[PDB]
Amino acid sequence: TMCYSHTTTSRAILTNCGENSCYRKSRRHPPKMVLGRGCGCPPGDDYLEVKCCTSPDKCNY
């Protein structure tokens, strides 16, 4: 999958994760600010929410 790789989606740059998933990590509790995006699927906990998707491309918006 091609994934977004930054905390903002504005910039015209992506990461080609290949066979790996995209992730989007954010604060689980409001304000739910995005803390990072990239390849793989790191573990969440009470503070951090991590969504992981394998398609379509840029699914980690």
- Give the domains, in start order, of the chain with CATH numbers: 1-61 (2.10.60.10)
Mention every residue, 6+ apart, whose C-beta is less than 8 A from residue 12.
none
Cα 34 from chain centroid?
8
Grouping H, G, I as helix, E, B as strand and the rest as coil, residue 1 is coil
Mention every residue, 6+ apart, whose C-beta is less than 8 A from residue 23.
3, 36, 37, 38, 39, 40, 41, 42, 50, 51, 52, 60
Sheet containing strand 48-53, strands side by side: 34-39, 22-27, 48-53
Cα torsion angle, 35, 38, 43, 49, sign: positive
Between the two ends of the chain, the Cα-to-Cα distance in Å is 13
- Please give the C-alpha separations between residue 33 and each of 30, 47, 50, in angstroms, as whole numbers: 8, 11, 12
